[PDB]
Structure formats: structure tokens, C-alpha cells
Amino acid sequence: LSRLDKVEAEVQIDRLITGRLQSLQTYVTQQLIRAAEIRASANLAATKM
Amino acid sequence: LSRLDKVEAEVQIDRLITGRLQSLQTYVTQQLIRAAEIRASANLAATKM
Amino acid sequence: LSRLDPPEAEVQIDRLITGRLQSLQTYVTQQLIRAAEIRASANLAATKM
Amino acid sequence: ATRFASVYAWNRKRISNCVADYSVLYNSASFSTFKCYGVSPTKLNDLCFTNVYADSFVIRGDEVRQIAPGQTGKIADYNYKLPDDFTGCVIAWNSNNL
Known part of the structure; x- marks a missing residue:
């Protein structure tokens, strides 16, 4: 932001966006699957209780 | 498709695919994980049946 | 690497890295979802043991 | 300056420890081209720098x-070469009495 005007700064930023967003979406997917596993464990624990 | 030629719109369509396809894959991933919860729901139900 | 210019050929590599990695993320999730689906079935299987 | 150096043997004036003024080089209309790669051409004032190499x-x-960096040519592969990750400005202007 401190070294470029609009038309090319937007490009470089866009390169960053597609990939930071990808990282976030990867994290979300991992956490979702991990949560489903934890749910199975929790239902088992409630059953044991 | 109506205002540009083959070359320059191909870059614009290139941006259109990544993101539509990605949202579709985002849609599939949301469906699959929720389906496993439904799959986890069902076996609990039929055991109670 | 045969017939391109290495000050610019990486741009063709640039999308070539992504779509191959984009394909790899599909293989990540497709394994992981059934992997939880196997284990949740398998923990039932050991419970049936 | 009166006389410059060749494209064969060029001149490197290392510049440090002074206050720059790029805007007076920017607004003065005595230039054929002004192409700043990696840095926006009017944002030259706000970023503060380590080392300056004046190459003429x-x-x-x-x-x-x-x-241009990355561009091939008989000056590029034989005489004077920029890296692909070059940043900075190249300025060229006409010389018909200069």
C-alpha cells in the first residue's frame, strides 16, 4: 500500500487474497471435521455417563 | 461475451471460473460434513428403533 | 523448460502450481471425510466386537 | 554532468546519507519516459531508503x-542486466545536444 498506485496494487493484493482466503478455508474445513470427531466422542461420553 | 474479443475476455472468464468453482467446492464440503452428521444421526435413530 | 523464456515462463508455471495444488486439496478432503466415516464405523465395529 | 560513461563501461555513484527530493525530478517536464518498477511512481516521497545507486x-x-528487467536483448544478455525482482526506476530522455 505504501509503494504502489491503484491498478497494480490491486493485482498484488489480489494475489495475497487468493491464498490467505484459501488458508482460512482450509482451517475451517479441518476444524469442522475435528469437531465432528469430538462430537462422536462427546455422545459416547454422554452415553457412558 | 458481448463486449470483448477472445483474448482479453479469456482472462476475465478465467477469474470467473475460480471462485464459482471454488464456491461449488465450498458448497460440497458444507454438504458432506453435514451429511456425516446426518449419517451419525441416522444410526442412532435406527438403534432406538 | 524446453521452449519458453525463464524470465516469463514462471507465469505459466504460476497457474500450473495452483491448479495442481487445487486438485490436491480435493484429494485431502475426499480422504478425510471418509476417514472419519470409516473410524466412526470402525469404532462401532470394535463395539460390535 | 558533462560526460557520462558507456554502456560498455558504466558508472556507479553510490549515494547514501542525504535527504532526497524525487518530486523535483518528477514534476519537471524534461523526460521522455519515467517507469518505476515495484514502486508506484508518485509514492517516491514517502518511503525512506537504505542505499541509492546512481547508474548512468x-x-x-x-x-x-x-x-526493462526480464526483457531480453543484445544489451540485456551482453552489456547491462537487471534481475527479475528488480525494484526502482529507470529514466530515459532524449539527447540531441546532450
């Missing part, structure tokens, strides 16, 4: 198409 020579006028 002379060239055939069509070979300003070949002075």
Missing part, C-alpha cells in the same frame, strides 16, 4: 525497449 550510461534509442 547511454544507449541506442530503440534499446529502451530492452532496458
Whole structure:
């Protein structure tokens, strides 16, 4: 932001966006699957209780 | 498709695919994980049946 | 690497890295979802043991 | 300056420890081209710098198409070479009495 005007700064930023967003979406997917596993464990624990 | 030629719109369509396809894959991933919860729901139900 | 210019050929590599990695993320999730689906079935299987 | 150096043997004036003024080089209309790669051409004032290398020579006028980094050419592969990750500005202007 401190070294470029609009038309090319937007490009470089866009390169960053597609990939930071990808990282976030990867994290979300991992956490979702991990949560489903934890749910199975929790239902088992409630059953044991 | 109506205002540009083959070359320059191909870059614009290139941006259109990544993101539509990605949202579709985002849609599939949301469906699959929720389906496993439904799959986890069902076996609990039929055991109670 | 045969017939391109290495000050610019990486741009063709640039999308070539992504779509191959984009394909790899599909293989990540497709394994992981059934992997939880196997284990949740398998923990039932050991419970049936 | 009176006389410059060649594209064969060029001149490197290392510049440090002074206060720059790029805007007076920017607004003065005595230049054929002004192409700042990696840095926006009017944002030259706000970023503060470590080292400055003033590199001056002379060239055939069509070979300003070949002075760009990454661009090949007989000056580029034989005489004067920029890296692909070059940042900075190259400025060329006409010389018909200069």
C-alpha cells in the first residue's frame, strides 16, 4: 500500500487474497471435521455417563 | 461475451471460473460434513428403533 | 523448460502450481471425510466386537 | 554532468546519507519516459531508503525497449542486466545536444 498506485496494487493484493482466503478455508474445513470427531466422542461420553 | 474479443475476455472468464468453482467446492464440503452428521444421526435413530 | 523464456515462463508455471495444488486439496478432503466415516464405523465395529 | 560513461563501461555513484527530493525530478517536464518498477511512481516521497545507486550510461534509442528487467536483448544478455525482482526506476530522455 505504501509503494504502489491503484491498478497494480490491486493485482498484488489480489494475489495475497487468493491464498490467505484459501488458508482460512482450509482451517475451517479441518476444524469442522475435528469437531465432528469430538462430537462422536462427546455422545459416547454422554452415553457412558 | 458481448463486449470483448477472445483474448482479453479469456482472462476475465478465467477469474470467473475460480471462485464459482471454488464456491461449488465450498458448497460440497458444507454438504458432506453435514451429511456425516446426518449419517451419525441416522444410526442412532435406527438403534432406538 | 524446453521452449519458453525463464524470465516469463514462471507465469505459466504460476497457474500450473495452483491448479495442481487445487486438485490436491480435493484429494485431502475426499480422504478425510471418509476417514472419519470409516473410524466412526470402525469404532462401532470394535463395539460390535 | 558533462560526460557520462558507456554502456560498455558504466558508472556507479553510490549515494547514501542525504535527504532526497524525487518530486523535483518528477514534476519537471524534461523526460521522455519515467517507469518505476515495484514502486508506484508518485509514492517516491514517502518511503525512506537504505542505499541509492546512481547508474548512468547511454544507449541506442530503440534499446529502451530492452532496458526493462526480464526483457531480453543484445544489451540485456551482453552489456547491462537487471534481475527479475528488480525494484526502482529507470529514466530515459532524449539527447540531441546532450
